[PDB]
Design a protein around this motif. Structure first.
Motif: not given
Lengths: 170, 11
Positions: A157-169
């Motif tokens: 479980y991940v207590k603090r938020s780990v997010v992908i804010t942007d992505c692409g090629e």
């Protein structure tokens, strides 16, 4: 070139952690890599009417000294996920092994159940060879991966938020 | 244990 290049911009605890750039083994696992590449650009529409995209998805399971898992673009907790080939697709091949940190491999729920979930190795994971399809590797941003590892726990479980804010090629 | 599954994560 032959292999596709894609990236994730990572946010940790609502703070940019940097970019992770991946090299996809398009030449070894074309179907698997195409799915991941398409999910980075969000070019395909899913079964729910929304375009399948890793953007804003999260890393729901991180276990230090093992791996960082994410890609549940439907439920964000591991119970969901969807590929451009449907709810799931067959295991292409297992030529590449988890012999080092920084490898991109497919998470699954048993034989031929690949969807959108994936994981990045933090150490060699030999016990997963032949069971999970390794389709890429980190070519830049391993420090970011180490930053994410720091957010995990033995429970996953991940207590603090780990997010992908942007992505692409690229 | 140490697996990477989607839905029933076990030991």
């Amino acid at each position: 070139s032959k292999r596709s290049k894609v990236f994730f911009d990572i946010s940790i605890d609502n703070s940019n952690a940097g970019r992770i750039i991946f090299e996809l083994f398009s030449d070894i696992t074309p179907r698997t890599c195409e799915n991941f590449r398409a999910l980075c650009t969000g070019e395909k529409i899913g079964s729910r009417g929304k375009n399948l995209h890793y953007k804003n998805s999260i890393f729901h399971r991180i276990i230090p000294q093992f791996m960082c898992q994410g890609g549940d673009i439907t439920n964000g907790n591991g119970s969901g996920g969807e590929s451009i080939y449907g709810r799931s697709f067959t295991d292409e091949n297992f030529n590449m092994k988890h012999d080092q940190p920084g490898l991109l491999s497919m998470a699954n729920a048993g034989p031929n159940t690949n969807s959108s979930q994936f994981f990045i190795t933090l150490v060699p994971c030999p016990w997963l060879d032949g069971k999970h399809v390794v389709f890429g590797k980190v070519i830049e941003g391993m420090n970011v991966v180490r930053e994410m590892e720091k957010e995990g726990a033995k429970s996953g479980y991940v207590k603090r938020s780990v997010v992908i804010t942007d992505c692409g090629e690229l | 244990x140490l697996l990477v599954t989607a839905g029933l994560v076990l030991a």
